[PDB]
Symmetry: C2
Subunit: 169 residues, 2 copies
């Protein structure tokens, strides 16, 4: 290997070690699911007759459980948590949607997610997405309304159990 | 960007900065060409009637001048120097080849290149290659004999002139 290859190898280890302080993907997924509950509860309490549940579909559950890929680490090392998907009982009107979106905004900001967008906002479809700090919170309604959250990248607890300064096998 | 992407971006800068201490590709290429001269001179002095020159072909000269790619950095940032190619006047017998190869070995070791190999060694073709520490020294003879040397990866002087801790544009 030349020097650039040797150093990049050292840097794989350093990258992992620098992420140890963040805690595990497993803890993050738990906490993000709690945050989804908080948002859904506040949304339901702000909006007359709105209800919610965690999606009970067994393959949605497995998919959320598995998480999403990190940008620069493989799935055996680190993953981005996906909070258990939230399904709302009723669709939102335009006014109620703005209320719910404000609640999502308030909670997302606590995670450093403050960059806002909407692919559309009408009877046909309503979308509110806010990202930042590697998090993404999305309230999307086409035929029915959902809340989803994906977190930043976290090392799996099995990597955290590896001594620091070592390449994971 | 997620955390892995943010950190990998930081690490590009760190990689470059950690290579500053090595000096420039331009200096390394000069020094490696001097080493090729040293080897060629010692070879010619050990072997009766052997002569050498730097290859005078203008496109060989340009190719050597341009160098080789580093493993993990682009050619606008760092390159591996290639010493001006050496062409020997006469071909080597088997005995003279072992003598010349021993001289290459002695000089290569000063650069940390000590891992030896030969793709063949006969009237038809004689090859002696020694590598290590990102260097490669090769004495190859098919129809005529050459000496080539490629060095480890070095930052271009233009990158060394950039203040440390900054991404090259």
């Amino acid at each position: 290997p030349d020097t650039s290859r040797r150093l990049t190898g050292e840097q794989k280890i350093q990258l992992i070690d620098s992420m140890r302080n963040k805690g595990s993907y497993e803890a993050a997924r738990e906490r993000l699911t709690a945050t989804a509950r908080i948002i859904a509860d506040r949304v339901s309490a702000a909006i007359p007759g709105q209800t919610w549940k965690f999606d009970d579909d067994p393959n949605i559950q497995q998919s959320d459980r598995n998480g999403a890929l990190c940008d620069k680490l493989t799935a055996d090392i680190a993953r981005r948590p996906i909070a258990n998907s939230v399904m709302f009982g009723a669709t939102f009107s335009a006014e109620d949607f703005k209320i719910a979106a404000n609640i999502v905004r308030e909670e997302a900001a606590k995670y450093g997610a403050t960059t806002e967008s909407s692919l559309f906002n009408e009877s046909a479809k309503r979308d509110y997405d806010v990202q930042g700090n590697g998090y993404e919170f999305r309230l999307l309604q086409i035929k029915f309304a959902t809340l989803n959250i994906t977190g930043d990248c976290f090392l799996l607890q099995k990597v955290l159990d590896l001594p620091a300064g070592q390449l994971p096998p």
